[PDB]
């Protein structure tokens, strides 16, 4: 049994079922004896009786086994063997991998139509010239939808706290939009994120399809079959009910890997059953790999441009500070300009126990309390929180205006601070979805609906701002050194 | 006892001795009763008999204790209290800190001459306009020598493996040069590096001075006095013998902290005894803090310029690759130009089982072996080692030419590689010292001499190149994506 209480620990890598669009044969390390097989091995390959115990050269035929063994030699990265001939002449696309000293063989009815390199080259050319992260993500959903013909294509970006944001969408006009919507970290368990990091590609042919059991589900020694790298691996019934509640019949997700971390997913949804042939899956995987590499470079360039711009801005200020006698007057005139360095909804100057504010800041009378707190915990270093009420309970009163704070000391001797503020994240939502869009539910309840996922997320981020990035804190530290530096020069 | 076998684990934070240029009094948490005192507390403060057991208000006087307690309130960061008046009118500079719920009070005969902020401002102004790491380090030794009047000023930079390099030097003409010399990691133990990370400043007044014991060395409960933050803490007899063998009578080291790590030391050596007054030590600490902050920014700018230049170079190449029909010919014509991206002593192209070399590369007949090894372990990612002979024993034969290798895959399908090489580090030495310079030794032996330190280091780095930096590998990865990317475009 699995319900909304234990699905966080569901062992989705050992379900003991495959999807019905193919058949699976498990063999020993050196592919000699057949240890396990899918019930539907009969229907597809046309073999009567039990396959377990019988030898590899017997069940498939000496011809094919020679080719499979030779390919295995050339690593848990599965080997693709498209359009292979069996004993009785039937044609199959074969996926072959070795994991936990068990050899797994997956059979699909052959396609042998579309060329895998040809499709991929066309798609990769149309994204290689993107000059921004925004330009790459926007065009990719549109492109994938047009090429693989899925009803909806989304990109999810994973936030610092594991939550997912829908950052791009291409869909049929009649479907509802999820663009700018968030889902909580719990909507994709840790063990699911582990498998998504191990498999570039993940297929669901039919959410309402009947799953085929693996025989035996557990062997003599009491071990289950690990289908971690098997493309036919069946899907959690919790996620199954989710897709059915949405009217999604089929899916295909591509893993976006950046700096060896799971950045997010390209996710294709279809409203009717749909399986891509092996050749099309090879092309989509190759596209996924290139999409990942290009985004990584664009992120690097973006971070780099941002730091360059901060260095330039700080030089401009240091050149001004040389020709102004009174530094305090310059800071009072200039402080608002520092909002160009770090994304913020407001900025403020606390100098000589006087307060100057710009944009969304806490109220005037709240500032002396904050200044005392900052001086207490700062210790002449940059201090930042995205949850000010967790540090100062009375800061909850003004969370809608300032939920997040980053503090920069501007003096080595006196307790003067440049303060950057952010509104609570729910205030900055640019969500575009039908708020009165209902979802039919199943046994588990209305928890498995986009509407309730979004509601749970919104609750989780109450009184919290967008977290300060590594790039934000790196710029804050360079600004601290510039300001402390020039403050020292001016006696 | 401590000898060259156990000095790696010497507990230098609890030596139970202070230096003779001041006296120490240990008190309880809330400075009520005197728990420990230095033997020389008598000579300096003019008090007869044992001080332990007697109350704080008694030994020092109710007047002074009020000021010390009040200052303690305003953190293991020691409080400076220059020119303080005792009971009988004597004048003392007082260092005051609280560590492990013990209050430690250090007394020096007062100076009250030089102004601490005035000296520091002058010094910091002369380094704030440095536009390169090289310009900052070079001018700092020269400046510190001229201002604090030490016979020799060195900067040591810590390598990845913990070894120290002398990267800058200002000295009296008659002294020998250590510029470009290395010392092994063992020459500064882990527990010493821990204290250098905790104390900005470290003084040795007289290496041949007589150490004053702390009474008691161990208390009732069996605890020693932790002098981690005490400026009078006595120095290891192993390091003492080292300085005497060099003809160094006094020292003062400043900790260079960059990204919260111990980057290195500014180290002042004097050939005669020398103690700086508290006011001069405050100024030197302040200079150290600013030197650290400026170097950190200059390192950031340098890393940033290097990555910018690589991006520019790769754009120039990608623009060329569009107008050339045959990519292989372009790579054969161009490969040597990629040596501008990553510091290397040679570079080579392995394409279609053909080899093209530039600069210091392994011999022609050795390359097919390397190409096979790289293809084996690479797995389509950047692979790098600074010790090629550790991975391929026969690579020892040509270590003088190529001890380090970084491999970049330039194809997704075929096993083609761009190879960058570095000579073994001893080949790239620009050392400027008298090789026939003898050192008088003590009980421990000739291990405690710069000559033997350098010899031990040279042995430790045999058959090894300068390690590939984080910036080197970041550029290699961006080059892999550029080259794999454009290789795919060209069918
Ligand atoms: C209690 C456990 C739950 C759970 C587990 C799993 N989710 C899995 C896949 C998956 N979940 C989501 C989440 C979405 N949330 C939305 O609001 C939404 C659409 C608007 C989606 C799609 C996503 C995005 C995915 C990835 C695939 C996809 O279709 O997008 C899985 C793994 C499935 C598998 O292939 O093995 C598990 C397990 N999901 C829950 O909602 C809960 C409560
Ligand atoms: C077995 C332990 C040893 C050891 C321990 C310690 N070294 C310490 C300080 C220290 N060592 C060096 C090394 C140098 N090597 C040189 O070749 C050289 C000059 C040419 C030097 C100076 C340095 C640089 C330092 C820092 C101070 C300095 O004077 O530069 C200490 C800590 C001393 C203290 O203040 O507590 C310990 C302990 N040193 C050895 O050589 C060995 C074998």
Chain A residues inside the 8 Å CB shell of B297: 478, 481-482
Nearest protein Cα to ligand 1, atom 8: A188
CB contact under 8 A, A489 and B296: no
Rounded Cα distance between B281 and B288, Å, is 10
Chain A residues inside the 8 Å CB shell of B286: 412
**Is B457 among the domain residues?**
no
Nearest protein Cα to ligand 1, atom 42: A187
Q: Which of A407, A314, A319, A413 is nearest to A367 (CA)?
A: A407
**Is A314 among the domain residues?**
no
Rounded Cα distance between A39 and B6, Å, is 68
**Is B279 among the domain residues?**
yes
> In this structure, are B266 and B402 located in the same domain?
no
Alpha-helix runs per DSSP H in B324-460: 327-334, 367-378, 388-391, 450-460
> In this structure, are A289 and A328 located in the same domain?
no
Helix (H, G, I), strand (E, B) or coil at A78: coil
Q: Which of A289, A294, A308 lies closest to B304 in CB terms?
A: A308
- State the DSSP H helix or E strand holding residue B210, giving kind and residue range, or none if neither: none
Alpha-helix runs per DSSP H in B324-405: 327-334, 367-378, 388-391
Residues sharing a CB contact under 8 Å with residue B128, sequence separation 6 or more, in sequence order: A485, A489, B290, B294
> In this structure, are A58 and A179 located in the same domain?
yes
Distance from the CA of B303 to the center of ligand 2, in angstroms? 31
A57 is in which domain, residue-wise?
7-299
Chain B residues 242-261 with CB within 8 Å of chain A: none
Rounded Cα distance between A477 and A381, Å, is 8
Determine contact, residues B72/B64, Cβ cutoff 8 Å. Answer: no
**Is A245 among the domain residues?**
yes
CB contact under 8 A, A125 and B297: no
> In this structure, are B288 and B141 located in the same domain?
yes
Q: Is A104 exposed, middle or buried (0-12, 13-18, 19+ CB in 10 A)?
A: buried
**Is A436 among the domain residues?**
no
**Is B314 among the domain residues?**
no
How many structural domains is chain B composed of? 2
Strand blocks (E) in A333-413: 346-351, 354-359, 383-385, 404-409
3-state secondary structure A83-106: EEECCCCCEEEEEEEEECCEEEEE
> In this structure, are B330 and B295 located in the same domain?
no
3-class SS shares of chain A: helix, strand, coil, % to 5: 40, 25, 35
Tracing tokens 């000059």 back to the chain, one arrives at A131
Distance from the CA of B9 to the center of ligand 2, in angstroms? 14
For residue B311, give the chain A residue with the closest CA.
A301
Q: Which of B282, B259, B216 is nearest to B77 (CA)?
A: B282
Upstream peptide bond of B216 is cis (omega within 30 degrees of 0): yes
Nearest protein Cα to ligand 1, atom 13: A187
Q: Which ligand 2 atom minimizes the distance to the CA of B243?
A: 29
Rounded Cα distance between B24 and B230, Å, is 9
> In this structure, are B286 and B331 located in the same domain?
no
Q: Which two tokens stand for residue A114?
A: 């579309």
Q: What angle do CA A12, A14, A19 make, to 5 degrees?
A: 80
Distance from the CA of A241 to the center of ligand 1, in angstroms? 10
> In this structure, are A246 and A371 located in the same domain?
no
DSSP state of A58: I
CB neighbourhood size of A118 (10 A): 11
Separation of first and last alpha carbons in chain A: 73
- Alpha carbon B220 to chain centroid, angstroms: 39
Chain B residues inside the 8 Å CB shell of A481: 293-294, 296-297
Q: Which of A294, A412, A485 lies closest to B128 in CB terms?
A: A485
CB contact under 8 A, A489 and B121: yes
Determine contact, residues B289/B171, Cβ cutoff 8 Å. Answer: no
Chain A residues inside the 8 Å CB shell of B308: 304, 308
Distance from the CA of A407 to the center of ligand 2, in angstroms? 39
Q: Which ligand 1 atom minimizes the distance to the CA of A7?
A: 1
> In this structure, are A11 and A102 located in the same domain?
yes
**Is A352 among the domain residues?**
yes
Rounded Cα distance between A78 and B3, Å, is 58
Pocket of ligand 1 (CB under 6 A): A 4, 7-8, 10, 12, 156, 178, 183, 186-189, 192, 202, 235-236, 238-239, 242, 251, 253, 267, 448, 450, 453
Chain A residues inside the 8 Å CB shell of B474: 300
Resolution value (Å, 1 decimal): 2.4
> In this structure, are B344 and B253 located in the same domain?
no
> In this structure, are B290 and B340 located in the same domain?
no
> In this structure, are B169 and B258 located in the same domain?
yes
For residue A290, give the chain B residue with the closest CA.
B485
> In this structure, are B65 and B121 located in the same domain?
yes
Q: Which of A125, A296, A481 lies closest to B296 in CB terms?
A: A481
Min Cα–Cα distance to chain B from A128, Å: 8
Rounded Cα distance between B79 and B443, Å, is 39
Nearest protein Cα to ligand 2, atom 23: B188
The CATH number of the domain holding residue A329 is: 3.30.450.270
Q: Which of A63, A114, A112 is nearest to A83 (CA)?
A: A112
The CATH number of the domain holding residue A20 is: 3.30.450.40
Any A CB within 8 A of B311 CB: yes
Which ligand minimizes its atom distance to the CA of B186? 2
Chain B residues 373-412 with CB within 8 Å of chain A: 412
Q: Which of A243, A235, A275, A212 is nearest to A44 (CA)?
A: A212
DSSP state of A130: -
Rounded Cα distance between B302 and A202, Å, is 43
């Amino acid at each position: 049994h699995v319900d909304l209480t234990n699905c966080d620990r569901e062992p989705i890598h050992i379900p003991g079922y495959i999807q019905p669009h193919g058949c699976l044969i498990a063999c020993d390390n050196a592919m000699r004896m057949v240890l396990r097989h899918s019930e539907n091995c009969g229907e597809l390959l046309g073999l009567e009786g039990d396959l377990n115990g019988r030898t590899a050269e017997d069940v498939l035929g000496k011809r094919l086994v020679h080719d499979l063994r030779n390919a295995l030699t050339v690593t848990t990265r599965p080997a693709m063997l498209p359009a292979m001939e069996t004993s009785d002449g039937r044609s199959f696309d074969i996926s072959l991998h070795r994991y936990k000293s068990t050899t797994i063989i997956e059979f699909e009815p052959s396609d042998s139509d579309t060329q895998p390199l040809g499709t991929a080259r066309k798609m990769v050319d149309r994204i290689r010239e993107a000059d921004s992260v925004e330009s790459l993500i926007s065009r990719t959903t549109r492109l994938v939808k047009a090429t693989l013909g899925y009803d909806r294509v989304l990109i999810y970006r994973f936030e610092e706290d594991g939550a997912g944001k829908v950052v791009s969408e291409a869909k049929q006009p009649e479907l509802e939009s999820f663009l700018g919507q968030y889902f909580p970290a719990s909507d994709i368990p840790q063990q699911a994120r582990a498998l998504y990091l191990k498999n570039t590609l993940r297929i669901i042919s039919d959410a309402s399809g009947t799953p085929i059991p693996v025989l035996p589900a557990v062997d003599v020694s009491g071990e289950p079959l690990d289908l971690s790298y098997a493309h036919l691996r069946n899907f959690s019934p919790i996620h199954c009910e989710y897709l059915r509640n949405m009217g999604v019949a089929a899916s295909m997700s591509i893993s976006v890997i950046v700096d060896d971390a799971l950045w997010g997913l390209i996710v294709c949804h279809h409203c009717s059953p749909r399986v891509l042939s092996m050749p099309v899956r090879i092309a989509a995987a190759m596209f996924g790999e290139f999409f990942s590499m290009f985004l990584q470079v664009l992120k690097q360039k973006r971070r780099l441009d941002t730091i360059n711009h901060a260095h330039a801005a700080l030089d401009r200020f240091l050149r001004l500070a040389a020709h102004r006698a009174n530094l305090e007057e310059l800071l009072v005139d200039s402080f608002q300009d520092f909002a160009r360095l770090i994304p913020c909804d407001g900025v403020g100057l606390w100098v000589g126990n006087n307060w100057h504010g710009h944009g969304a800041t806490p109220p005037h009378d709240a500032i002396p309390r904050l200044a005392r707190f900052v001086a207490s915990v700062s210790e002449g270093r940059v201090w930042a929180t995205h949850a000010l009420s967790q540090a100062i309970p009375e800061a909850e009163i003004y969370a809608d205006t300032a939920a997040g704070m980053l503090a920069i000391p501007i003096s080595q001797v006196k307790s003067d601070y440049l303060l950057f503020f952010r509104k609570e994240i729910v205030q900055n939502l640019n969500w575009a979805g039908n708020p009165e869009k209902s979802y039919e539910t199943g046994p588990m309840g209305d928890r498995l609906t986009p509407r309730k996922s979004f509601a749970i997320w919104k609750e989780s981020v109450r009184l919290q701002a967008q977290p300060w990035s590594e790039a934000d804190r790196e710029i804050a530290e360079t600004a601290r050194i510039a300001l402390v530096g020039v403050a020292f020069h001016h006696s």
